[PDB]
A paper describes a structure:
In order to determine whether the diverse sequence and spacing of histone Kac residues can be accommodated by a single BRD, we systematically determined cocrystal structures of BRD4(1) with the diacetylated peptides H4K5acK8ac, H4K12acK16ac, and H4K16acK20ac. In all cases the two acetylated lysines bound simultaneously and with identical conformations to the BRD4(1) Kac binding site. The N-terminal Kac always formed the anchoring hydrogen bond with the conserved asparagine (N140). In the N-terminal region of H4, flexible glycine residues allow variable peptide conformations with two (H41–11K5acK8ac) or three (H411–21K12acK16ac) linking residues, whereas the large side chains in H415–25K16acK20ac fit perfectly into surface grooves created by the ZA and BC loops. These structures explain the similar affinities observed for the various combinations of di- and triacetylated H4 peptides. ITC data collected on the first BRD of BRD4 showed a 30-fold increase in affinity between the singly acetylated peptide H4K5ac to the most optimal wild-type peptide H4K5acK8ac. Consistent with this notion, ITC experiments revealed a binding stoichiometry (N) of 0.5, indicating binding of two BRDs to the H4K8acK12ac peptide, whereas only a single binding event with significantly increased affinity was observed for the H4K5acK8ac peptide. Intriguingly, the wild-type sequence “GG” of the H4 K5/K8 linker region seems highly optimized for interaction of the first BRD of BET family members.
Author numbering:
A (entry chain B): 1 to 12
B (entry chain A): 42 to 168
Write the structure that this text describes.
């Protein structure tokens, strides 16, 4: 894995 | 780091055809995924510069996205249905390589992938 993209308003 | 150039989408040195299954892939399969609530992370190449992902293209060497796939279909870039399906497959696996389990985008990919598999089960007959 890399650093990732963050939340996309589904959560949480 | 710069972004790499986007994947090639037009190559007139490849012969071109339209087939029942390629048309279905563009007008039904891709169209259905494209308009899904979870499509948007997959609608264009990852812009590592604007998203500040300096590691993205260190990790992902075969980028692929639905924007590219759409352009390839519009350009008759694929001769066989399976070439298009392979590009979808690559797009999903890249997501699972780069992003951590539990992340929102992984949930989104899994839902789109399940839908993709369902739609591919409905391809029409080959010439």
């Amino acid at each position: 894995s890399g650093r990732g993209k963050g939340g996309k308003g589904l959560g949480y | 780091s710069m972004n790499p150039p986007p994947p090639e989408t037009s190559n007139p040195n490849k012969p071109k055809r339209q087939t029942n299954q390629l048309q279905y892939l563009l007008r039904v399969v891709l169209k259905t995924l494209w308009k899904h609530q979870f499509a948007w992370p997959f609608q264009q190449p990852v812009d590592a510069v604007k998203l500040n992902l300096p590691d993205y293209y260190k990790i992902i060497k075969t980028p692929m996205d639905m924007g590219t796939i759409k352009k390839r279909l519009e350009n008759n870039y694929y001769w066989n249905a399976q070439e298009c399906i392979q590009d979808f497959n690559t797009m999903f696996t890249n997501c699972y390589i780069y992003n951590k389990p539990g992340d929102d985008i992984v949930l989104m990919a899994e839902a789109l992938e399940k839908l993709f598999l369902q739609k591919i089960n409905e391809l029409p007959t080959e010439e």
